[PDB]
Amino acid sequence: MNPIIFIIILLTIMLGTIIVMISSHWLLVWIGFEMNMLAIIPIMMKNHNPRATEASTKYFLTQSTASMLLMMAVIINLMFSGQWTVMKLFNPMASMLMTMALAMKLGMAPFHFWVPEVTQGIPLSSGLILLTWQKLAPMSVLYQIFPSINLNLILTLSVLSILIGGWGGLNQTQLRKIMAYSSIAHMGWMTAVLPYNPTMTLLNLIIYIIMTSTMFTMFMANSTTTTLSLSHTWNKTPIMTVLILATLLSMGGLPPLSGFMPKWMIIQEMTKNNSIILPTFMAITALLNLYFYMRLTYSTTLTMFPSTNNMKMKWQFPLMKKMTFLPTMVVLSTMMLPLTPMLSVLE
Amino acid sequence: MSMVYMNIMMAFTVSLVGLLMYRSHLMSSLLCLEGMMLSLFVMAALTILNSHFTLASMMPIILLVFAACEAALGLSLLVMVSNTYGTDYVQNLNLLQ
Amino acid sequence: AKTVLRQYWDIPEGTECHRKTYATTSIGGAAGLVVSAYSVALKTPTSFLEGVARTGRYTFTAAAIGAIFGLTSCISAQVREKPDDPLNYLIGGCAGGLILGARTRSYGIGAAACAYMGLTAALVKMGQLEGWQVFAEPKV
Amino acid sequence: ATFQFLPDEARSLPPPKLTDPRLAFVGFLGYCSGLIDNAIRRRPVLLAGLHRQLLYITSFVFVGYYLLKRQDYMYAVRDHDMFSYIKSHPEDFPEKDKKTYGEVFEEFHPVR
Amino acid sequence: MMLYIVFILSVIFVMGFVGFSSKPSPIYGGLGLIVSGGVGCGIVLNFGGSFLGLMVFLIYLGGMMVVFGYTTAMATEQYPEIWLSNKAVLGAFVTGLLMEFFMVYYVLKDKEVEVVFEFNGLGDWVIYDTGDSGFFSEEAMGIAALYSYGTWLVIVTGWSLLIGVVVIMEITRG
Amino acid sequence: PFFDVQKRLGVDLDRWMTIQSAEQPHKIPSRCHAFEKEWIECAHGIGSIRAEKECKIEFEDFRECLLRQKTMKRLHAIRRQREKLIKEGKYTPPP
Amino acid sequence: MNLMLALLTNFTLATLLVIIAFWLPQLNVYSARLPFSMKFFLVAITFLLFDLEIALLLPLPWASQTANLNTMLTMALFLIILLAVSLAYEWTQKGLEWT
Amino acid sequence: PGIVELPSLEDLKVQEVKVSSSVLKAAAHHYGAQCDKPNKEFMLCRWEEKDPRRCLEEGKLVNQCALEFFRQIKRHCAEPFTEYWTCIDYSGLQLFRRCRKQQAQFDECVLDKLGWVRPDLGDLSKVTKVKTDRPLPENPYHSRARPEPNPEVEGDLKPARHGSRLFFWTM
Numbered sequence A: 001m002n003p004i005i006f007i008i009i010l011l012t013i014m015l016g017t018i019i020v021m022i023s024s025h026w027l028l029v030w031i032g033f034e035m036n037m038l039a040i041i042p043i044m045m046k047n048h049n050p051r052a053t054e055a056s057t058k059y060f061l062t063q064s065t066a067s068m069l070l071m072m073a074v075i076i077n078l079m080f081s082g083q084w085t086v087m088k089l090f091n092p093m094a095s096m097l098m099t100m101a102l103a104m105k106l107g108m109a110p111f112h113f114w115v116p117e118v119t120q121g122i123p124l125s126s127g128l129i130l131l132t133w134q135k136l137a138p139m140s141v142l143y144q145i146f147p148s149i150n151l152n153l154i155l156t157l158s159v160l161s162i163l164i165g166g167w168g169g170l171n172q173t174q175l176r177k178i179m180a181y182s183s184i185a186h187m188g189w190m191t192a193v194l195p196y197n198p199t200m201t202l203l204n205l206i207i208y209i210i211m212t213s214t215m216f217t218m219f220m221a222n223s224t225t226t227t228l229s230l231s232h233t234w235n236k237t238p239i240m241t242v243l244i245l246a247t248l249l250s251m252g253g254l255p256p257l258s259g260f261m262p263k264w265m266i267i268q269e270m271t272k273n274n275s276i277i278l279p280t281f282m283a284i285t286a287l288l289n290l291y292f293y294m295r296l297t298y299s300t301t302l303t304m305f306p307s308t309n310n311m312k313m314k315w316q317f318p319l320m321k322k323m324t325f326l327p328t329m330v331v332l333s334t335m336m337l338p339l340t341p342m343l344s345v346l347e
Numbered sequence B: 001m002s003m004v005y006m007n008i009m010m011a012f013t014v015s016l017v018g019l020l021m022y023r024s025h026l027m028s029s030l031l032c033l034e035g036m037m038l039s040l041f042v043m044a045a046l047t048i049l050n051s052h053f054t055l056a057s058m059m060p061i062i063l064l065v066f067a068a069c070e071a072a073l074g075l076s077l078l079v080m081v082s083n084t085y086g087t088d089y090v091q092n093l094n095l096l097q
Numbered sequence C: 001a002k003t004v005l006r007q008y009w010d011i012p013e014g015t016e017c018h019r020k021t022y023a024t025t026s027i028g029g030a031a032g033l034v035v036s037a038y039s040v041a042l043k044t045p046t047s048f049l050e051g052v053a054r055t056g057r058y059t060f061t062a063a064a065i066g067a068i069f070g071l072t073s074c075i076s077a078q079v080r081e082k083p084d085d086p087l088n089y090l091i092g093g094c095a096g097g098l099i100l101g102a103r104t105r106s107y108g109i110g111a112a113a114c115a116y117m118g119l120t121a122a123l124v125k126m127g128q129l130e131g132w133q134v135f136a137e138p139k140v
Numbered sequence D: 001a002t003f004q005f006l007p008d009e010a011r012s013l014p015p016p017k018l019t020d021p022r023l024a025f026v027g028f029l030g031y032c033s034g035l036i037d038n039a040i041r042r043r044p045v046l047l048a049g050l051h052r053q054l055l056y057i058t059s060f061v062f063v064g065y066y067l068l069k070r071q072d073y074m075y076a077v078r079d080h081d082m083f084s085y086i087k088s089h090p091e092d093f094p095e096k097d098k099k100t101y102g103e104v105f106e107e108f109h110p111v112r
Numbered sequence E: 001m002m003l004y005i006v007f008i009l010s011v012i013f014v015m016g017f018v019g020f021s022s023k024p025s026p027i028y029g030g031l032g033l034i035v036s037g038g039v040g041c042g043i044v045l046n047f048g049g050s051f052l053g054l055m056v057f058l059i060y061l062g063g064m065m066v067v068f069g070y071t072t073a074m075a076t077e078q079y080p081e082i083w084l085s086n087k088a089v090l091g092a093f094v095t096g097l098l099m100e101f102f103m104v105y106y107v108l109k110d111k112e113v114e115v116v117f118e119f120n121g122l123g124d125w126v127i128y129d130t131g132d133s134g135f136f137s138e139e140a141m142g143i144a145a146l147y148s149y150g151t152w153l154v155i156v157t158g159w160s161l162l163i164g165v166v167v168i169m170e171i172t173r174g
Numbered sequence F: 001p002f003f004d005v006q007k008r009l010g011v012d013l014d015r016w017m018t019i020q021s022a023e024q025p026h027k028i029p030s031r032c033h034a035f036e037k038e039w040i041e042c043a044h045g046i047g048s049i050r051a052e053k054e055c056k057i058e059f060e061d062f063r064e065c066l067l068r069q070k071t072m073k074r075l076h077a078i079r080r081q082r083e084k085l086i087k088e089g090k091y092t093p094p095p
Numbered sequence G: 001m002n003l004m005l006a007l008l009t010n011f012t013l014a015t016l017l018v019i020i021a022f023w024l025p026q027l028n029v030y031s032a033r034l035p036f037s038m039k040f041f042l043v044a045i046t047f048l049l050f051d052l053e054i055a056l057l058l059p060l061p062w063a064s065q066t067a068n069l070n071t072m073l074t075m076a077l078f079l080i081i082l083l084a085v086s087l088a089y090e091w092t093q094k095g096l097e098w099t
Numbered sequence H: 001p002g003i004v005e006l007p008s009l010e011d012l013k014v015q016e017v018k019v020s021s022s023v024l025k026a027a028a029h030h031y032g033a034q035c036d037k038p039n040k041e042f043m044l045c046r047w048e049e050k051d052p053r054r055c056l057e058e059g060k061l062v063n064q065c066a067l068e069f070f071r072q073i074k075r076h077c078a079e080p081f082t083e084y085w086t087c088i089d090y091s092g093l094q095l096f097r098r099c100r101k102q103q104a105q106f107d108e109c110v111l112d113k114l115g116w117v118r119p120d121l122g123d124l125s126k127v128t129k130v131k132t133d134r135p136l137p138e139n140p141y142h143s144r145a146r147p148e149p150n151p152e153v154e155g156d157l158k159p160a161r162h163g164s165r166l167f168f169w170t171m
């Protein structure tokens, strides 16, 4: 890709998301999703191989199907209220379709099958956009229509995502599939608290984006896409193993790291609503995620895996990738718990 | 509701089921995707026309334009898939299992 | 599914045993169908008759588990004369747990299922008695 | 207001002190980012690029200062809303008559 | 009766959808969609949507569906399999028609049917607007308003179409 | 909107098409203009929780204008009673 | 009715002429990828996208009646320029070539 | 819900203006100039009451003024007028520009015999003012009382008491 075209396509991705977040009209929300999808396909295809073509095709079909269901919900809403305003919907059938459409876009279980495959089939930089920026638009709609959302449906989607995301990650050695199942589990926490306190959805979303961006950036810095490739980092960039260790433990929700804060604040909100079984089940199930984060820390940081002779050649050359914002992101990924009350800025 | 809404809603469902029950040709699924859009256009036009909601008259056109541009992207991916395996069968798109 | 659970919970405890088993079997039998549906969809059976055999296999097991749980749980309350006691479903839950071990021909799985199903069933009675919410309505 | 970071009413509140302990922590986080920047690029961690390290601290403090202001404004708004609601609905928040422990009866549970 | 033309068209509309949704060869699936598109225009025409109806012919049928058929000739099929020669397509085709017929038979007899949701059967003419004598097409006034009210709609639509050109060239370069 | 840029900048990007009682070309009214107008004014500024109960009457009327489900049900009732009576020869339509 | 009668007559007559063409006394007693360029696919897609922009331009004769002429003309020219820009992009990117 | 009041069938009887559209088209410009007062009183009533049942009396005065208008053409200008609207009637679009010769003859006849002046371009589209003794409608939409607004909040914004109060935090 021409560097100027790449920038223009990236801005179109951003503009599609922004349109969704500033629109008060359902048609413009739908247009935002269409624009966003149109511009995201070229960055998935940018390395021109059969796996990239398969990923883009599977992505296109899933997102296109969801956008059709979103439009169907919009028209049903128009039939029963005679208006297009982006807010609660005025028909239960429209609410179910819109909720399922957005769950499909987010990749929540049991509409989750595309996320591991699409992420595996596209470059790390494209996966970073897919699993972070692309969550903003569907979540911003869910933030506005949640009063009309069926509580049983949304909590069922949340519980299944935490279970599927946790179990799916245990069997993975590919770093992009691990991140994909991590994403599915984390969307579950975001939507579980949505009916009770949407502010905690935003808090979990922002913190998730920061840690996920950190992990993808560190994977890109070393061009690692597999567990065994990542296990060579100790014999090249020892510092990077420590950063990876801390970030993974944060993503595991261990105190006193930043990734504890969203799980902690979400448990608080549901208990205030006399919801005890659900937070307890979710916290225990999230130990599945902690297990396969810990496995990565074992092979990356806490043990020294075997190396290769040709690695000595790498010792002589500096790390020249941009690694943009990594020092900032990694510090926020790990050391923000003392500043937790700052979550009220999102209110 | 009116009679027509029964059949128009049914047509959307039929094409949705058709889309979710894949066969072999990827083209056949793109047709079901475009059938869903057709019924959406007809359903919205009928609602907007009957209610005399004048400024919404442009909405079905905007839907048609974006959907067709969206269908163009789908056809581009189909030809790239077909250039790789010689057919558009969806059972060839299983490398990422 | 709300309606099926309603008639089960509508009836008292240790009364109309044949009605409880019908309800529990119906609940369990449906779950076997849902499990069967995804199984054949995501794991294509070798032949049409092979898929029917798999569907019957799963559905029979799920129906059997629910049937025994309701039968065993409602008799226990009847014999012990303790309608509102979690231990009744603890017996009902383990009974259904053992059936799974039999259907899977694994004494280890039966013991594991006995405990997990037994504790789960007991917790369901405590929640019913004390109004535990799983999907709590937002209040604050 | 709508889509305003710090509405005009927030100027009635006292500003955060430049010696705020939270602001010092934010400054510390900025310093840590400066060191990790040197480490990933294999520079001398403590000495390298003092100009860069100065901007890391300054950037974090500057952004941290305004986030602290919004944080304090949002909690003040929360308290302001809550007291107004209590004032406007005295029937839901009655001043109950408190009794003394000599009057109230509490069961004794011996530990023996 | 002619008073039920819209209902009659909507019945054919559904059959066309069953035609290509059962997914025969995409050559015939495309034909089923062309017929549905033409019938879809007919429905829209009878609700006063002259301009919107003709856009279906011009854009949906004369544009998008031509490219669909064009691409099918290149990348999908050149010869079609005998229509209904596959058991699955015929089964789906027969399944849809019978479901459609049972829906139509009951609504006509009762002037109302309950397929999941409640539907009337008196006729679509009953919901129509009664008084009209403006000296213009209201449907045309709304679409023309795109250039005076919908500045925002034009910009984002215009941008997206330009991006479509850029993106498709990137996708197909290889 | 999630970010209300339109209100904050005072720019109308899409609010003009959101409702059918807004300004229209050549003052063409929608069929349910008065019903939507009444329901919007009742529900303005009190929030959807309050509006769902206190403006229920306006919304019910507005929904009747939109879909005419009650009106069709009443006509379908008179049509049933006529083409029945006509069979028992007890009614004769006027010229 | 008149238009439907016209359409029925035109295509019914076409059907009759086609069948009598196929029938007459003869007095006798005894799915893959075409080897076809990607360029031709790109012509079809390019036509489609331009055809969509022509759809947006068709209302222009009615839009010229508005009192908001300043806005109408600016958006009308904006749409055509962007259509020209996409043509320029294809041209410079060798998209209108056949070699 | 109540019963929709409707006026009796004999409360709606009136002498209708039983002439074709090309006759009205030919007479429209003089008609608009001559019958403006009852016409605008009726249109004021319709847009104010929003109820056709409430303007039936003024609607009747519209017919009377129109019948009197045409009885006055029939009494002085019958033959020039018949030539004119017969030329209008011939056109499929009933165009004025095809009949300027016959229009002038009719225009001259009414001016000479009735002092009628044809309104100039732009006149009949003017917004005019009408004097009416009909009281201004109070609740034309028949709207209920509006819900009371939520208790508005007014006061001095003080710092949050003891900060966020989140678990253990002191600020």
Ligand SMILES: CCCCCCCCCCCCCCCCCC(=O)OC[C@H](COP(=O)(O)OCCN)OC(=O)CCCCCCCCCCCCCCCCC
Binding pocket: A237, A238, A239, A240, A241, A242, A243, A245, A246, A249, A256, A257, A301, A302, A330, A331, A334, A335, A336, A337, A338, D039
């Ligand atoms: C304050 C409030 C917040 C509280 C939460 C806790 C915040 C702390 C987490 C901050 C984020 C992680 C950043 C940690 C900085 C690590 C830098 C370091 O200590 O040195 C790394 C070391 C140097 O390697 P290098 O520079 O490449 O070459 C050495 C030649 N002299 O690299 C090596 O030599 C590799 C050594 C082998 C790996 C040993 C792994 C065990 C040690 C891990 C310690 C970090 C664990 C972080 C978890 C939190 C701890 C509480």
Ligand SMILES: CCCCCCCCCCCCO[C@@H]1O[C@H](CO)[C@@H](O[C@H]2O[C@H](CO)[C@@H](O)[C@H](O)[C@H]2O)[C@H](O)[C@H]1O
Binding pocket: A277, C005, C006, C009, C010, C119, C120, C123, C124, C125, C126, C127, C128, C129, C130, C131, C132, C133, C134
């Ligand atoms: C290893 C642990 C595994 C997870 C264990 C999870 C335990 C979860 C407990 C489930 C919730 C408690 O169980 C549920 O409680 C509510 C009461 O609030 C009951 O609610 C019902 O009870 C009454 C009984 O008269 C019925 O009339 C009525 O239908 C309804 O009120 C449900 O019938 C019961 O199923």
Ligand SMILES: CCCCCCCCCCCCO[C@@H]1O[C@H](CO)[C@@H](O[C@H]2O[C@H](CO)[C@@H](O)[C@H](O)[C@H]2O)[C@H](O)[C@H]1O
Binding pocket: D044, D046, D047, D050, D051, D053, D054, D055, D057
């Ligand atoms: C903008 C705000 C920035 C605030 C920065 C405040 C601290 C800045 C310190 C700058 C000077 C650091 O200078 C650097 O320090 C370390 C230890 O101190 C020295 O290097 C060290 O190596 C080893 C320890 O690793 C020891 O032998 C000994 O401690 C020392 O020799 C370097 O020889 C010196 O170059």
Ligand SMILES: CCCCCCCCCCCCO[C@@H]1O[C@H](CO)[C@@H](O[C@H]2O[C@H](CO)[C@@H](O)[C@H](O)[C@H]2O)[C@H](O)[C@H]1O
Binding pocket: E148, E149, E150, E151, E152, E155, E156, E159, F010, F011, F012, F013, F016, G068, G071
């Ligand atoms: C990819 C490119 C992205 C570039 C984004 C640039 C943003 C463009 C902003 C367009 C909207 C400008 O702001 C908006 O313009 C239109 C026309 O001028 C105005 O609209 C005007 O035309 C009609 C006439 O009645 C009505 O909509 C309205 O009565 C009138 O104000 C809006 O009052 C104004 O709010």
Ligand SMILES: N=C(N)NC(=N)NCCc1ccc(I)c(Cl)c1
Binding pocket: A196, A197, A198, A199, A344, A347, C140, D074, D075, D077, D078
């Ligand atoms: N929907 C929810 N339960 N949560 C929620 N956002 N409640 C609103 C209550 C609240 C809480 C903190 C602050 I600071 C402010 Cl100003 C207001």
